[PDB]
Amino acid sequence: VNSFSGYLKLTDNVYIKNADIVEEAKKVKPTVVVNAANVYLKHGGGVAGALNKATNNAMQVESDDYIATNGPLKVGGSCVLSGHNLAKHCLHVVGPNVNKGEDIQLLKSAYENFNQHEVLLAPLLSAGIFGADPIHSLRVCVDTVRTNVYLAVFDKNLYDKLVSSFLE
Ligand SMILES: CC(C)[C@H](Nc1ncnc2[nH]ccc12)c1ccc2c(c1)S(=O)(=O)CCO2
């Protein structure tokens, strides 16, 4: 149903809110929720862990079956699988992990995947333990994505910094 509410409008197609992406998925019932995935779709911690646990592990079981037959994704790539109880579809997107020496330039390719969907609920790619500068990730999102993206950022201090920095 895509019933998003409480978002700050950054541009004509990018919105942001201080919220857990899992609680937003349950309230909004989006067509697409983006996962902050890794290439073997191992959803143990962070955003992926929170989404998988909200599916009661159904996301991990389906992801393991996909990897068995198809192998790992590439950094900057994506894969549409079921959204289970959270969304119609889950778009698993692999942003670069700069804390593990991956190339930050591939962050643009990661966001380009969003342009295949009219509207998406998404986390801020390559932030948290993946190490990218969160202000840089938001700029790559705004400059790359054309479709309507609702960013859920589950940390008040980071949210307040991103908004303040964007409004400079
Ligand atoms: C920057 C934080 C606040 C953000 N966490 C979140 N953002 C939105 N809903 C959330 N629910 C639970 C955590 C969570 C974030 C965004 C991207 C990201 C990771 C974390 S990660 O470290 O798990 C792996 C790389 O990708």
UniProtKB/Swiss-Prot annotation:
It catalyses: Thiol-dependent hydrolysis of ester, thioester, amide, peptide and isopeptide bonds formed by the C-terminal Gly of ubiquitin (a 76-residue protein attached to proteins as an intracellular targeting signal). Inhibited in vitro by GRL-0617. Residues 1-168 form the Macro domain. It is found in: Host endoplasmic reticulum membrane. Changing residue 164 to L: In strain: Gamma/P.1. It is a multi-pass membrane protein. Responsible for the cleavages located at the N-terminus of the replicase polyprotein. Participates together with nsp4 in the assembly of virally-induced cytoplasmic double-membrane vesicles necessary for viral replication. Antagonizes innate immune induction of type I interferon by blocking the phosphorylation, dimerization and subsequent nuclear translocation of host IRF3. Also prevents host NF-kappa-B signaling. In addition, PL-PRO possesses a deubiquitinating/deISGylating activity and processes both 'Lys-48'- and 'Lys-63'-linked polyubiquitin chains from cellular substrates. May form homohexamers. Interacts with N protein. This is Papain-like protease nsp3. It comes from Severe acute respiratory syndrome coronavirus 2 (2019-nCoV). The chain holds residues 1025 to 1192 of 7096 of the full protein.
